[PDB]
Amino acid sequence: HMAFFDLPLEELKKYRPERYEEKDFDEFWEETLAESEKFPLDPVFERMESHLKTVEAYDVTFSGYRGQRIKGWLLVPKLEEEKLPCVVQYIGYNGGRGFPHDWLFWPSMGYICFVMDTRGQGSGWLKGDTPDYPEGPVDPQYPGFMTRGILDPRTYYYRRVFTDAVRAVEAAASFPQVDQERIVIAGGSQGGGIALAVSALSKKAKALLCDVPFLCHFRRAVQLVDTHPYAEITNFLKTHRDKEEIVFRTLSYFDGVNFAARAKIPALFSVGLMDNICPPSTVFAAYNYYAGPKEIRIYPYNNHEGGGSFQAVEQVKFLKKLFEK
Amino acid sequence: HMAFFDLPLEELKKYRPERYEEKDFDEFWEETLAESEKFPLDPVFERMESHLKTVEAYDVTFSGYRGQRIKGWLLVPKLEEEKLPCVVQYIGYNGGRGFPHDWLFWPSMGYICFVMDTRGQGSGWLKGDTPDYPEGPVDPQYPGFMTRGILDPRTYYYRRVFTDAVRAVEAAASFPQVDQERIVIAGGSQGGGIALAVSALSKKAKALLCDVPFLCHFRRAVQLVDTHPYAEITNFLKTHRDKEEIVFRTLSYFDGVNFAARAKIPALFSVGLMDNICPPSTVFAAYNYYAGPKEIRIYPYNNHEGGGSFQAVEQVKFLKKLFE
Amino acid sequence: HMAFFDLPLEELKKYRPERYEEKDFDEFWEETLAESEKFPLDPVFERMESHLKTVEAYDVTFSGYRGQRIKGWLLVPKLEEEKLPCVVQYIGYNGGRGFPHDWLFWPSMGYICFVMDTRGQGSGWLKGDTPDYPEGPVDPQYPGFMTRGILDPRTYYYRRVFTDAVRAVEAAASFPQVDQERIVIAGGSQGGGIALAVSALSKKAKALLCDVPFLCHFRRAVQLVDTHPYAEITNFLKTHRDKEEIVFRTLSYFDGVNFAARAKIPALFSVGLMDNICPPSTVFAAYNYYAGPKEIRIYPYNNHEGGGSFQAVEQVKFLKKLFEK
Amino acid sequence: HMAFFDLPLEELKKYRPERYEEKDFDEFWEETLAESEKFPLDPVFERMESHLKTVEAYDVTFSGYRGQRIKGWLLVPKLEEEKLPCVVQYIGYNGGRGFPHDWLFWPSMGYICFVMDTRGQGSGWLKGDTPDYPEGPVDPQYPGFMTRGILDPRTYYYRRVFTDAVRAVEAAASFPQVDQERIVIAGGSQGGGIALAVSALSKKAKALLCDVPFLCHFRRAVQLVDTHPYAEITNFLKTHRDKEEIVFRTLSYFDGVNFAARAKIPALFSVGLMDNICPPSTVFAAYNYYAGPKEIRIYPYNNHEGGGSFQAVEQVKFLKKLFE
Amino acid sequence: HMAFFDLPLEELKKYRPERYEEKDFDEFWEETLAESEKFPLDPVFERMESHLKTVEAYDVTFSGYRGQRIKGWLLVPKLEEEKLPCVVQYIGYNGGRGFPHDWLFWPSMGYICFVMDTRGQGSGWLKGDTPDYPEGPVDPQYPGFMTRGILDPRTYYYRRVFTDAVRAVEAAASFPQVDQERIVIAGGSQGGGIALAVSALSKKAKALLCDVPFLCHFRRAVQLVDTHPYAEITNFLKTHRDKEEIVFRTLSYFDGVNFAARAKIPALFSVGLMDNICPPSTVFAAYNYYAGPKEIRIYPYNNHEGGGSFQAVEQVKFLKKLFEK
Amino acid sequence: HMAFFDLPLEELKKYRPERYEEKDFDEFWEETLAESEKFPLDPVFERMESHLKTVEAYDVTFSGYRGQRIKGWLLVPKLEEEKLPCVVQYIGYNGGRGFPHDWLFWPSMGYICFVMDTRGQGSGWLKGDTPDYPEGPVDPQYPGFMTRGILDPRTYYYRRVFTDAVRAVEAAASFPQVDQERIVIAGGSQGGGIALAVSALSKKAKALLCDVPFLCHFRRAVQLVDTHPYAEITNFLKTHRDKEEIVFRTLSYFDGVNFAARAKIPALFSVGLMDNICPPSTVFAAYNYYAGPKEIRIYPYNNHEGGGSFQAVEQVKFLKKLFEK
Ligand SMILES: [Ca+2]
Ligand SMILES: [Ca+2]
Ligand SMILES: [Ca+2]
Ligand SMILES: [Ca+2]
Ligand SMILES: [Ca+2]
Ligand SMILES: [Ca+2]
Ligand SMILES: [Ca+2]
Ligand SMILES: [Ca+2]
């Protein structure tokens, strides 16, 4: 067999495929957010009995999509400064909020960390505590989250997740020790696709950290790789042979490329050139359309792990320099 | 690597592991069926335009779990006889009702065939048209159907599927040309596990055809094989390390072995001794506890395909002799 | 690894590679057929005791290559019409005629169905009952049928199969209830390659159904995919490093592309764009050279399963419309 | 997945499963050999132009099964001794006689080497030049040689190979520089199963070298491993679900374990305890029933490669001691 | 294929296979430690520039095997307490000390953390900075560390690693804020096997954390699994067919089962019943022979990940109770 | 999955990628060889008691890199001619000199054969007896030999191997029955890469046999294939994300393409076009830059086995014609 390869790096850097979105993309999202804003946010922070000594940990509950109650953690490092910067952290596919001690990186660097639990997931590599609540009937689907409600953008799973995620920034901003001028939205892989949505839809985010982003350039992802989770879509289309146009129409409303074209905040991206889960052409498509000030860290030899702890160093340096003005 | 192997056949034939079920197993199912019976069945058969010439095809809708509307097909062979025997057909994992022409076997053999669509699935190997409707919140789960609602038997996905399947036999029986003395429940793999449940829960079924059954002896299945779909449960338990006792309690209410101990109608089973999706020990555990008159066809060299078209011949000969 | 991909669709639709055949291609086939016609067809249809109720089943025996007796099934739906249309069904690799109840589709749609057993196979996924009878010595070969007798077109396995298949249509035509104006030849995968040969060699076929055809564009197939059964040819060539020119000369006489260029009857093809057993470039090469009226159904997300039950629907609609003209 | 393991070594050393053969096993082989002996052997040795300098190479042709003409190589080391000992070398599955320079080991150790080409193979890992000639119709079969004619011992492929192989020893013995008191029959894997047959059927062989033998204890092999080529039999049985008894009856006539029970010449065996192509329980079954003086070299950590060049050293030493 | 399974749990709980060690096992280790103690430990702690805010990070250097200079990190949480408890952390196969921010768990829980870099590794999943120094010639070996110097225990790779690890505890104990009554040795997988050796050889360790231990019951490991790294041994033995007795003789001196029989400090073990890297029978053999006060957490459905974050919670609670006395 | 494919043959035939070497490449090698030449070669040939009858077998010892003692075999066929031609044979990755009877081909063809043992390997498919002796510290590395000392060309493993190999030709030339006008350097795979280095560095070699060469065009190899052993370099780079430039700078001094540009003796190459261990583009890059008289045998359907026994025949014929003048 042939080892994975995408477009050459010189082509990746110029890759700007034709965008496809419906004319009501913005109106869809405006209505979605307006509907959810009719419910009070009702943020709840409850301090936990914990063995943690350098951080205070809080159980979080807030109202996400249509008032539905989403879990999280808030880790506050024990420091003298009265207002601290904050990272809102979104989680990779099949993960959930786990335990507070699973998210010590940002607090150790002096940042408040808001970890948003992902509705209905939390059963693959880290446990979760938040259910999904569907729009009535749960249509035929392929196992997983990628095709859950895919026949209509109004019923699609990521409509609810992205709305949760925009509301999570509001919930973080409500914590009294959070410096609202230094709120960062962050994620890798599904988390990066969520953060990319939030960068276009939120008014409160001040910077984006976007690693090896998933949920980008769907039509290309499906043709390029046979890995999960993009293969969920392919397997659905293999069966539902009459639904191709509808499937990609729905997905157009949730595509990171279309959000990137609307985002204005400063962003640090990362990409692995041998990543066969989130292919480099899908990541570069999103990066290249990203409309805010931007940088990308390129890891030529890395698969889905990306830059690992090297990239974490880059992120801390990037934010320090940004927030010095 | 090591080739798949289960217990030797001589051990499989005596394999009767200790059963685990809760005290309220029967009460759970009695309440479930009573609550769904409060909605009218409202079976609808709508003759469709079709290119089929030897068969009349109907679009089916009936009320399953809690009045929720389930799709299916009814295929009636064009024959002179006024009352015909009927097979109620349940579908394998990730399948759905597909097209009428996907179910030509039983009609061709002179049987009315009622194909029940599987709620929420239909996206893997044959398309489906029936949604699931959850009991409120859809809890954290691993991709698929095996762990959907698994923390409480009341919320568990197969509660709804098994209720649909019991109601499907009532729907079939309400068709005027069906001979109610010759209603057969049939399935292979997930369909076999569904049919095994129906064999204990239904009052209308007269015979069971149970091929290579899934949804049997969960605790053993999860230790034995790393194949999907049983690995969905294993993967959930890898993450939710605190939920093991709860998971297996819930599953006990849906285990084919526990239904088999309650079933009284005549049954023909099949098993593939090299089946690593539905291991022979889980299938023999169910067969060995099956409380009605029973036979099993054993296919020593077959994987999940079982007896294939050979077993289809065994089934037709079995039912002919039974109903004489 | 890399996920399978062939030429882009826009290139596939224009793909007309240079054809290679010997100057005696037609003479080879004329002599082959003339030599087999010297034996009487002697078609025998024997009614069977069956549990089937909507269809009458017949055990079939007829003379194929050089008078050799080939088995089949004939399924006749119980309908009032005195002359019925007929599908001659060829079978995929490692399959055979199985049981009569394995072929209920076409009879259920009102067609007589003649299923031809495949000589010497019948041991992979459906049982068969017909032997092969070689031209004397059985030369060194790689396991399978693809290299059986490959050093000479006169000894090659598919010379015998394709002659059996041309005689199968004569056998079907001899059944009294068959409408000879509505004889269809049909197959998928090896069956599709057999059917493609018959479309060029038979005088009795009126329409072709050709799904995901095997036995097409061998030189491309062997360099594109490492899957069986094309890999049998590759494996033979890895060992018999002196026989490359002879192997591809022999295969030129049996290539679906060379038959397609001679076929004049109306045809419906199908192709799976992710099919790595019968690659889309080999299928499109045959489709593009096909010299009769033609259509193709394209399944972008399907592998070797092709259009499945969706394509069955297309085939029934195609034939209904054709035979109403 | 799980890593391959067979019976523990202590159990392997005592493993003597019940043997199955038909009452006419000996008569079947007596009648097969007598029929082929009615054609003259007509051994032809044709010196070749070669770049080889330490060895003389001959193109061999002789009559095997029913007078059919089998190819081979004869390699004679250029030594002063007027009569030399001889190794008759059988080849592994999908191999053939290749080139003369592929068989330099035994000649370099001072032995004449007769390499028998394998009918109809020669297309996997080493080229071959000898065709098969079937007993009329070539029945339905799974790809390969293991199920070619398997529905009748008289049509089965290995009937013709084993007969060739017995005649190969007669052909080698006819070469004037061969010392007939020091004729060795040798093989690994398919070669070893061939050699094991020849050790029971030939009158001319004086010693057996049998490495990691294939064609042994078929019923166990098929249940134990899913590797090729034993899997060819399994796959044929998955489809021809009515032919199980007939398949194993045929195979009984060709099983190394039944030949081993009849062999009287001295033998050196080898076995790899992690061999998942020729499992150690099938090899030990044949070794344990072997009726002549015998030794086995056991390689606990090796797969199908066995003892490799270490074993080759064992074989040279074994034969030197034996022929002193 | 067959999914991985070891002995049933009820058998695992009683599994005490016969131990094999040479008569000079203790003398070998006494001599090894005495020889390395002749070089000064010369521990160096160098406060480094870091973006970490809740922790003080130190570059560590100390003398391990025969005076050779080994790297590490020391992470000290910023807390008012003047003496703190300490975890000496050993690293999994193909890993190294990485960056200080890779080891935030224990400091966040109020423990000083001493992370020992692994000589010659650090190139698989986390970077390292410490070379190996062989005893003269580097004999023929299979790729990796398992068979490096395996023909003599005096030249074997893990002789040098285990001596470094015993000296790492002495280096940690020399830090003035370390409470010497609360020094813990900890590791998972290779780290667990190192920690197990240290639990027998060190005089300063007060508690052992030993997760999914590697380097245990080699003869069984090599029989049971075909995974790396145990398969490095098998692959060496496949080639060096004359060296079986020598290989297992050497390995006996480094076997966690033989150290466990000598260890007296309180321990918490963990085991995954589906672990095919470190099989449960090799782990239970070590646990069952462990001579100090002991508990084991059993994870029936987990592979080599073990208890993950659940086990981390178990470790924190275990130590808190132990050191309350 | 996608089956392996490299550039089309017509492109391979013209493939001359831009070469990268440091401006001290020649000076590095001149100094390396001069430093090793300060130690006496001290060749030792000791006749063995052997069961071989057509060949005399000698145990060889000679001084390779910096006086270090390297093992080998010398096989002398028993012929009347007083001086014989000689093949110096280098060995594939994870192999060693094995037993004398493993190398009977060249002696049987009337050539003396000098088999050089490969330092530190000999544990994968054929046993070896020669250790490595590192330049002091053995830095962090990935399992295997490709990354051993890779951070500095002075410490790199192949500096020592290539020096041994140049000295092996001198050792061979010292045997009294060797005709020094007919000394051939030969290898496949790692052996071919070693031989290619020797063809530029040795003054005594008269012809090169170079099959499916490894150690060629590293930057391309690492992008193209995910197979071992080239993946050892990729794996090292995935972790040491800061060391890319250094790694490829080191490797430039050991790249077969750069030696090929300097080699002047006649050469026979071979290449398998389906070889995914040594890709055809890396082999053709070296062949195309080869500066001496050259021929290549192309095996379009072979993987890493190349031309096998067919190529052995090509080699014997090639050398016969060459040495006839
Ligand atoms: Ca708009
Ligand atoms: Ca009760
Ligand atoms: Ca309708
Ligand atoms: Ca012509
Ligand atoms: Ca007898
Ligand atoms: Ca002692
Ligand atoms: Ca420092
Ligand atoms: Ca220079």
Characterization of this structure:
Six copies of one chain form a homohexamer. The first copy, chain A, has 325 residues and is α/β, with parallel strands linked by helices. Chain A has one domain (1-325): Alpha/Beta hydrolase fold, catalytic domain (Rossmann fold), CATH 3.40.50. Helices cover 33% and strands 19% of the residues of chain A. Chain A contains eleven helices and nine strands. The first copy, chain A, has helices at residues 9-12, 25-37, 105-108, 157-173, 190-201, 218-224, 230-239, 244-252, 256-260, 280-289, 308-323; strands at 44-47, 55-63, 69-77, 84-89, 112-116, 178-188, 207-211, 267-272, 294-299. Chain A has a nine-stranded mixed sheet, sandwiched between helices. In chain A, helix 10 links the parallel strand 8 (267-272) and strand 9. In chain A, helix 6 (218-224) crosses helix 7. Chain A is globular. The complex binds calcium ion (CA) (8 copies).
